[PDB]
Design a protein around this ligand. Sequence first.
Ligand code: HEM
Ligand code: HEM
Ligand SMILES: O=C(O)[C@H](Cc1c[nH]c2ccccc12)NC(=O)C(F)(F)C(F)(F)C(F)(F)C(F)(F)C(F)(F)F
Ligand SMILES: O=C(O)[C@H](Cc1c[nH]c2ccccc12)NC(=O)C(F)(F)C(F)(F)C(F)(F)C(F)(F)C(F)(F)F
Lengths: 453, 453
Amino acid sequence: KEMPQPKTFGELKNLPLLNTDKPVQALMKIADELGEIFKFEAPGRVTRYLSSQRLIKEACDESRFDKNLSQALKFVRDFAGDGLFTSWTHEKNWKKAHNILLPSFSQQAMKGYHAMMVDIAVQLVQKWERLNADEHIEVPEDMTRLTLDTIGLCGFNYRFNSFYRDQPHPFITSMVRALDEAMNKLQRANPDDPAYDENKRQFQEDIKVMNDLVDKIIADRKASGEQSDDLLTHMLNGKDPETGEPLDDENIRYQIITFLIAGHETTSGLLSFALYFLVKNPHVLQKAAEEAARVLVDPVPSYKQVKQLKYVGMVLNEALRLWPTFPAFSLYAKEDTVLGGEYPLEKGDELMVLIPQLHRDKTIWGDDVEEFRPERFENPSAIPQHAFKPFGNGQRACIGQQFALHEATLVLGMMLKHFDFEDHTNYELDIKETLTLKPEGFVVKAKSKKIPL
Amino acid sequence: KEMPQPKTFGELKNLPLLNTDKPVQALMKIADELGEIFKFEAPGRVTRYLSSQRLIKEACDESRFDKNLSQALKFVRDFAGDGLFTSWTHEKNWKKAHNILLPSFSQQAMKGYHAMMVDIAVQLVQKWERLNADEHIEVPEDMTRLTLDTIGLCGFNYRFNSFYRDQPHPFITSMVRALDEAMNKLQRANPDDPAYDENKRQFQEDIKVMNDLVDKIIADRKASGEQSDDLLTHMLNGKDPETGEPLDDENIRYQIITFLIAGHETTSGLLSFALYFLVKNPHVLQKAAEEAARVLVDPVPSYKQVKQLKYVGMVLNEALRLWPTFPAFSLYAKEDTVLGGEYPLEKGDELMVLIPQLHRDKTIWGDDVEEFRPERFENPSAIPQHAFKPFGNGQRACIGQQFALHEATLVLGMMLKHFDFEDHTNYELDIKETLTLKPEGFVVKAKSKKIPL
Ligand code: HEM
Ligand code: HEM
Ligand SMILES: O=C(O)[C@H](Cc1c[nH]c2ccccc12)NC(=O)C(F)(F)C(F)(F)C(F)(F)C(F)(F)C(F)(F)F
Ligand SMILES: O=C(O)[C@H](Cc1c[nH]c2ccccc12)NC(=O)C(F)(F)C(F)(F)C(F)(F)C(F)(F)C(F)(F)F
């Protein structure tokens, strides 16, 4: 039985297929042509891309497969270290940090973060209230200002003040450039070529910038002793119940860098896609706006009011179905095993879960998988197990899921309460790929409903 | 009596003395050397610089002298046109605009603008509340954000959104570059030298940017009929009592451009100098802060509360004494006349009033004229006529005087209510000159008192 494989480039095998600005979208097209599984080879490396719920449900069995660091994550590890996102499950610091931080990311914890989320959300709305008549909004740029500032503030009581700037904060410049470099390393044949020497030097300079700001943030909080109820305070004080150990300061840095990466890259994309779908589907926008108007009856939304925004939740989940913003995750076989009754795997063999394809599995979702329909999530127990995984799988799933959904629900709810929206350019979806997916160049006009804050 | 005169450069006469980054400060030093009057010659022209109250009181006699357009103002007229600032007193549009606008710039008119002034002032306070512990404030840069935005909003219901940017608005970039070219054209031999073709092209392009935006603003408003009740509304509807004529749309544009020049340049300089002198004089800062705390008992300052900030007003007047931010104005003799019983002048002969030197006249102020003492203004009536002229003279005095002082008082009151200030760099005063004066590089730290808004 021969597993499908895309086109090759002689000795380089499939590698040059990733020499593109849009590798995930390319892989989606290959998946459409080849089906639920294909092998992908490079010099000295092989993986298998999975696209169907029936295979992915097996891949998600944690007794058989564990999280793998893709080559992308191995490069991100050069600045995110053994933080939660780029550590192996068997490294002592994973379970330790996981145990310490899980309570700080719970739904109940969101009650405590809510006030600071509102602070940044109000800044966004005020920005849009203050635009002149025929000016427009640069959507992913503003969502990124919001999401980065929220995690900065909620997490570590640090204000990036992104709405006060055109040029990002120096940490963000370095982080964005470090991420770009990490993703660019995947797609260059002969990575030791002299041309890439300057890229490597700038990389080391960006890592240093990140470490020095965050180390300083940690040291400052240690030296002040201030008990600001946030992630940083929790990490400086908390002990892992299992080992009885706290995180050391180096690992705390790695977690902070990791949360900032997450806040910048991934939540902003969700909000950007959600707004994109709303302006392309005005009946959905109407339903979401009506809910926002009916529910958010006070100038400052409450935690309880955000929980009440069911339809806005459904909008966000349908946006995640179509464009899960961190679109692939990797697994390895813990032991020899056979996938799907058909594909034998050896210990250590790697799998890639193509989340956007899983979410277009017609045998699960129906034939209309490209349509934006939030009512797919109106009665969510209808969704089969492992059919919807925008936040990954099992113990290695996104720790920030509740944070991200709370922020996104609050913000999207406020946006729909306060403004009508116009797709003035009839924007053509163009998806930029970094660590994540975003709708590049998405612009709208927002006409104020003149409801005070 | 042969008039004193500074050093000459052969056939260039005194012209090269103004070929300096700091021409007003140069002229002040010359005044120190030469006294109350000196002649200043260049090829094809002459003026006389006055520095004493004794002589300036004659110059300010409107039966004997009228406002002259200095060469600097003649160049500003290429983009400010026949707006109030760059028009001759005998021009029909001067008298029309004067009669139409003056009542809208009264102390009592400020009740109408107060709310919009608070809007921008709160944005400033919030920016500074949001700075992190280690960070500092770029004072003139932030003061200019405030003052430009205030005149934009109050004047024409237009939001430059300066607190949302590092890059100034396109209009501002052009205006600033226009004003720079005007300044540069002064110290320049042959204007039609092909060398300056690019300068002229840039100049024309900046005029276009300025006219296009402002004309659109005006046209947009005329269309809607929206009675926004600002300077633009008054200008579109208002009739000159004398002629019975309104301003035409072209002249309205020049007034708006003129207001924007004014609210950008001179007013922010005042606030920057005031804060400078406050941090250099801690006892004065403390007295002003006591008043602010005693008077501004509400989170939103009221119009009447700003009028009660007597000491803050004294502080601003003392800043204006030392560093009047539009530091000189020009006059011409309406008829042959003798100045000071010594200097015969012919009809058309020109004078320059060197305001910073007038304000250092030891016969009026006492020997300690370099000292910052707001108490000099305990009773502003006590100052002799024509001794204190930071807003110029007579019917050609600053129309924006009450606007500027109300805005500056409000803002400085709020700053002193909400923050303690630290001169963390022990800043060395360095005054940059364009057509106005500012303390370049003035930076402070502001520690919040944590009083909510
Ligand atoms: C819409 C927003 C987000 C999406 C779609 C998303 C998606 C994901 C996915 C798919 C994974 C699994 C990665 C893998 O298997 O390799 C993951 C892991 C993670 N995410 Fe997110 N994420 C989001 C927001 C956030 C936020 C806001 C934070 C933190 C502030 C965060 C922190 C993390 C961390 C720490 C992990 C690693 C968890 C572990 O292995 O222990 N994420 N995320
Ligand atoms: C600290 C702030 C300010 C200072 C020191 C200042 C100073 C002056 C001075 C000295 C003049 C006389 C010019 C001459 O004789 O050639 C003047 C004129 C003028 N100023 Fe200001 N000014 C300030 C703020 C403003 C503001 C905020 C506005 C408008 C919003 C404004 C509008 C004008 C206008 C229109 C004139 C021309 C008046 C006329 O001749 O009819 N000024 N200003
Ligand atoms: O980084 C990796 O390991 C894998 C695949 C890969 C990269 N190099 C390989 C060599 C042989 C076989 C497979 C690979 N990379 C990808 O699938 C990808 F295309 F880069 C990717 F999809 F864009 C991605 F990196 F996974 C991603 F989607 F951007 C990421 F967000 F990181 F998951
Ligand atoms: O613009 C002018 O006409 C006059 C005088 C002048 C400029 N060029 C001259 C040649 C010969 C004799 C006099 C002059 N300029 C000045 O006095 C000046 F102070 F140098 C000035 F800086 F240019 C100034 F323009 F006056 C000023 F001070 F910057 C201004 F803000 F405009 F008042």
